[PDB]
């Protein structure tokens, strides 16, 4: 998910809603936003509902994991070792004593 | 719907940047329709289309007094 963040959250999604095709944004310039009242903006509705649209879910160009060595550097900075030597000092005995010994 | 207060109403400009108004029409024909066939015993190229609903005895302008004469009661425009 850290590696995904450098592909999904950084830049565009942190700055704008990216998108293409369909009704889209337009410079409607119909009237001043707040002159007669504080609520003139977006009073008018959109022109039509979308029929359909087609686009691939993932590619090497977009939305893929784009893994890097420095993401693994961050991952290993966030190490969580499953056990510690305070157990292995006991478990090592339990290991070696299991054979040749009983 | 209602009255407009010309002293204090929102009179909102909108620009038809998409020329949607050009799709609007008041049913008026621009020209006489193609190839009238008057005097022919038969006519063609007009379809048949199921009613969206039933229509009353009252809504037809002709309404001759016969107790049972017209139940099939089909209709078509001036074409």
Swiss-Prot record, chain A:
Domain remarks in the Swiss-Prot or TrEMBL record: AAA-cassette D1 is required for interaction with PEX6. ATP-binding in AAA-cassette D2 is required for interaction with PEX6. ATP-binding and hydrolysis in AAA-cassette D2 is required for proper function in PEX5 dislocation.
Induction field: By oleate.
Function in brief: Component of the PEX1-PEX6 AAA ATPase complex, a protein dislocase complex that mediates the ATP-dependent extraction of the PEX5 receptor from peroxisomal membranes, an essential step for PEX5 recycling. Specifically recognizes PEX5 monoubiquitinated at 'Cys-6', and pulls it out of the peroxisome lumen through the PEX2-PEX10-PEX12 retrotranslocation channel. Extraction by the PEX1-PEX6 AAA ATPase complex is accompanied by unfolding of the TPR repeats and release of bound cargo from PEX5.
Other observations noted: Present with 2100 molecules/cell in log phase SD medium.
Gene: PEX1
Organism for this UniProt entry: Saccharomyces cerevisiae (strain ATCC 204508 / S288c) (Baker's yeast)
Whole-protein coverage range: 922 to 1023 of 1043
The family this protein is said to belong to: Belongs to the AAA ATPase family.
Protein name: Peroxisomal ATPase PEX1
Compartment annotation: Cytoplasm, Cytosol; Peroxisome membrane
Swiss-Prot record, chain B:
Subcellular location: Cytoplasm, Cytosol; Peroxisome membrane
Recorded superkingdom: Eukaryota
Note: Present with 1630 molecules/cell in log phase SD medium.
Domain remark text: AAA-cassette D1 is required for interaction with PEX1. ATP-binding in AAA-cassette D1 is required for attachment to PEX15. ATP-binding and hydrolysis in AAA-cassette D2 is required for release from PEX15 and proper function in PEX5 dislocation.
Subunit structure: Interacts with PEX1; forming the PEX1-PEX6 AAA ATPase complex, which is composed of a heterohexamer formed by a trimer of PEX1-PEX6 dimers. Interacts with PEX15; anchors PEX1-PEX6 heterooligomers to the peroxisomal membrane and mediates their association with the peroxisomal importomer. Interacts with UBP15.
Biological role stated in the UniProt entry: Component of the PEX1-PEX6 AAA ATPase complex, a protein dislocase complex that mediates the ATP-dependent extraction of the PEX5 receptor from peroxisomal membranes, an essential step for PEX5 recycling. Specifically recognizes PEX5 monoubiquitinated at 'Cys-6', and pulls it out of the peroxisome lumen through the PEX2-PEX10-PEX12 retrotranslocation channel. Extraction by the PEX1-PEX6 AAA ATPase complex is accompanied by unfolding of the TPR repeats and release of bound cargo from PEX5.
Family: Belongs to the AAA ATPase family.
Protein name: Peroxisomal ATPase PEX6
């Amino acid at each position: 998910l850290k590696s995904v963040h450098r592909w999904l959250s950084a830049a565009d999604q942190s700055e704008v809603v990216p998108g293409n095709d369909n009704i889209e944004y337009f410079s409607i310039n119909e009237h001043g936003r707040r002159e007669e009242n504080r609520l003139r903006l977006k009073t008018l509705l959109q022109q039509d509902v979308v029929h359909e649209t087609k686009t691939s879910t993932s590619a090497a160009s977009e939305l893929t994991a784009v893994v890097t060595i420095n993401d693994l550097l961050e991952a290993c900075q966030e190490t969580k070792p499953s056990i510690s030597t305070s157990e292995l000092v006991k478990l090592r005995g339990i290991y070696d004593r299991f054979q040749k010994d009983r | 719907q209602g009255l407009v207060d010309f002293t204090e109403t929102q009179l909102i400009l909108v620009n038809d940047t998409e020329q949607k108004l050009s799709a609007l029409k008041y049913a008026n024909e621009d020209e006489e329709y193609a190839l009238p066939k008057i005097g022919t015993n038969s006519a063609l190229s007009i379809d048949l289309e199921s009613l969206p609903c039933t229509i009353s005895r009252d809504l037809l302008r002709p309404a001759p007094h016969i107790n049972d004469d017209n139940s099939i009661y089909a209709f078509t425009d001036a074409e």
